[PDB]
Amino acid sequence: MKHCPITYEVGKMSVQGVQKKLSAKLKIKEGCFEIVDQYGQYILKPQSDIYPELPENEAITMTLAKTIGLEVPVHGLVYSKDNSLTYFIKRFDRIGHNKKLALEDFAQLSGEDRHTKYKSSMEKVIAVIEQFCTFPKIEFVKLFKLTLFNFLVGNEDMHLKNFSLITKDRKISISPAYDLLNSTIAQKNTKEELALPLKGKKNNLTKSDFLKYFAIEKLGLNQNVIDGIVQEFHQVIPKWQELIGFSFLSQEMQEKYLELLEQRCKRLNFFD
Amino acid sequence: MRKAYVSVSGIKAGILEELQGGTYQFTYFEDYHGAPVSLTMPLKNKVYDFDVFPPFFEGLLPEGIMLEALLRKYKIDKNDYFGQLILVGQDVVGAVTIEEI
Numbered sequence A: 001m002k003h004c005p006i007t008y009e010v011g012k013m014s015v016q017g018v019q020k021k022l023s024a025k026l027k028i029k030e031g032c033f034e035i036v037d038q039y040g041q042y043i044l045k046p047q048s049d050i051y052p053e054l055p056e057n058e059a060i061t062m063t064l065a066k067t068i069g070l071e072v073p074v075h076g077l078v079y080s081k082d083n084s085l086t087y088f089i090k091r092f093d094r095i096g097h098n099k100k101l102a103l104e105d106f107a108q109l110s111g112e113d114r115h116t117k118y119k120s121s122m123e124k125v126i127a128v129i130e131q132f133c134t135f136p137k138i139e140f141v142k143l144f145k146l147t148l149f150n151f152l153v154g155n156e157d158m159h160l161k162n163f164s165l166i167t168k169d170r171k172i173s174i175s176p177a178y179d180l181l182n183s184t185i186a187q188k189n190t191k192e193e194l195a196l197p198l199k200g201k202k203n204n205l206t207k208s209d210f211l212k213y214f215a216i217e218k219l220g221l222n223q224n225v226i227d228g229i230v231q232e233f234h235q236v237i238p239k240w241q242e243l244i245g246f247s248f249l250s251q252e253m254q255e256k257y258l259e260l261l262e263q264r265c266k267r268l269n270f271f272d
Numbered sequence B: 001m002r003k004a005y006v007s008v009s010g011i012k013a014g015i016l017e018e019l020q021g022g023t024y025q026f027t028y029f030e031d032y033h034g035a036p037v038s039l040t041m042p043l044k045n046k047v048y049d050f051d052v053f054p055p056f057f058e059g060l061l062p063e064g065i066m067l068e069a070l071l072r073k074y075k076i077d078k079n080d081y082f083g084q085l086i087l088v089g090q091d092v093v094g095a096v097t098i099e100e101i
């Protein structure tokens, strides 16, 4: 909260709702962040008092997404005033000169709300994309890649409000990535693998669920496209392992992250 | 009752009105010809009725601890979603702004 970058540029279940999301402006001269109540261009996420190391978790996870080729906005870490680390991200609905871009989350687009942002499915997510996106086939490739990533890095909190459509230069597409982190290792007694069911499943998902039911029958991707993306994830595992070990996570948190990643890679036969 | 101007990127787009019996209604200004307030509400219709708070506008309200922060700043009751929207309406995600009449 309010400082300058470092090495970096109710029976419900939610997890992101234990961490603050602060608006901030980038000080032009000093190059440091200033929390403001309104009219900010950045979002700052300080440490949570309930779940540990969320800023470091979010920062490395968004960097892993950038390495595999997902659209990721500028993000990083800053030291808060209490000498802890705070995550920041550049808003993509603000574009300098104080202009704005239209941005709508999938709960808004599908008629759900905050209390029911988990009462949906990835089949319903696909339908929203087919309705509103300028190039749905291009967006389906991105969705497939996003869903595989979230499974591998243990993001079980991809509810309806974590998908958004951005309207930029008259083109409607899935927004850049936001709110991606390994929420499985941040909790204890993690209850699900996927926030929204796929083929009616939120746990014990298998290779044929992602690569056959999802990729072929629901997204209509050609087999050669699926194979190329799977290969992409295969080639990135060594790079991911290196980046996590070089991150700002604690050693214990790094080990939880690596062990989860290996377990998810093994369920998709990455090492077979 | 309570009504609010709804603007898109600074240009006044329409009026969101609190109607009796818990219903709500949004009406586009005939002069408006810019981008729609939301993709579920294009300019081909002018009037939209809602039996609850319209999901699009509910989607602009804070969540989690940020909602707890709003509720201890302002003297407003939780579940008064329209009242909370007017309080934050100067600056929300996207290009839409809300101002009370």
Ligand SMILES: [Cl-]
Pocket (backbone or CB within 6 Å): A134, A135, A136, A137, A138
């Ligand atoms: Cl297309």
